[PDB]
């Protein structure tokens, strides 16, 4: 259950989102190549060929348009679906540290893979032929579920699990008839009051992502679902 986050816009992505790429890397440890040198060379054929030998199961790609618009490309290796995202609003992990009154530096908490929670994904009313159908929320849920290692009730110590990652769909606002997600990361701090309370310190980054499309293959295949363009049968 490894992965590799890559600035696919080579080095010309800019310093703002180059630091963002390291942020979502340093969040997604330990199943990531922390020493990965994304050169101004290379393309998709270079990473997805190596990824089988390195045993990488998912690829999160970061691309900036000619308009400066940032997109996130989550693709299941090596021919799986790609999950095209659009970065609407963002803030660097450093930026969370300035606003925080007492930032908590990384200790042993950043070597254990975190806990993924899902909120408002799938179920609520939807429709089989909706704008965003039930048979698409299912695909997105298994996408991020497979993105992390399994948790076992018998063997995994609760002392080990020390980070949590929040992803919630914004169906709270009625003007969102579209797929918009909010990505946050928290540190589990346990205070025994046996009664123990868990308090979460924020780490960042803070993503506001919107689905642009989903495609069958590695940047190819037939687009399964577009918000803007509906292809005739």
């Amino acid at each position: 259950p490894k992965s590799m986050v890559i600035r696919i816009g080579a080095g010309e992505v800019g310093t703002s989102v180059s630091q963002l790429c390291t942020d979502v890397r340093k969040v997604m440890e330990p199943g990531t190549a922390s020493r990965l040198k994304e050169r101004k060379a290379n393309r998709l054929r270079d990473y997805v060929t190596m990824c089988g030998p390195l045993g990488v199961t998912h690829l999160l790609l970061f691309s900036r348009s000619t308009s400066g618009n940032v997109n996130l490309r989550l693709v299941v290796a090596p021919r799986g679906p790609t999950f095209h995202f659009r970065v609407e609003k963002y803030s660097l992990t450093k930026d969370v540290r300035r606003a925080q009154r007492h930032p908590k530096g990384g200790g042993k908490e950043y070597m254990t893979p975190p806990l993924l929670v899902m909120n408002n994904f799938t179920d609520p009313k939807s429709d089989a032929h909706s704008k965003v159908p039930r048979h698409l929320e299912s695909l997105t849920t298994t996408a991020f579920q497979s993105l992390f290692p399994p948790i076992n009730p018998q063997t995994t110590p609760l002392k080990s699990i020390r980070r949590v990652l929040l992803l919630n769909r914004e169906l709270s606002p009625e003007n969102d008839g579209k797929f918009v997600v909010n990505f946050r990361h928290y540190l589990i701090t346990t205070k025994p009051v046996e009664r123990r309370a868990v308090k979460l310190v924020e780490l960042g980054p803070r993503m506001r992502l919107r689905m642009t499309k989903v495609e069958e293959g590695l940047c190819s295949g037939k687009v399964l679902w577009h918000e803007y363009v509906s292809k005739s049968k």
């Binding site: 929670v117 018998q154 609760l158 949590v164 928290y186 979460l200 924020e202």
Partner: protein
Amino acid sequence: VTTEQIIERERKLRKIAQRGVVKLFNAVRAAQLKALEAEKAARREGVIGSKQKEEKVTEMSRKGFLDLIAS
């Protein structure tokens, strides 16, 4: 003006992630602790030293204990 209401919307489902962490923390913990009490129940039951029998029932008990708290 618009900026500082966001923090108490930010704190609002800050608290949601707390509830999800709280949910799984005791759902797993009650799955182990009730299984251990069901583990010593086999030692007082009479299962004849057969690791497959005291692992399937041991696992099947854990399935029920996680399912009961979540639903």
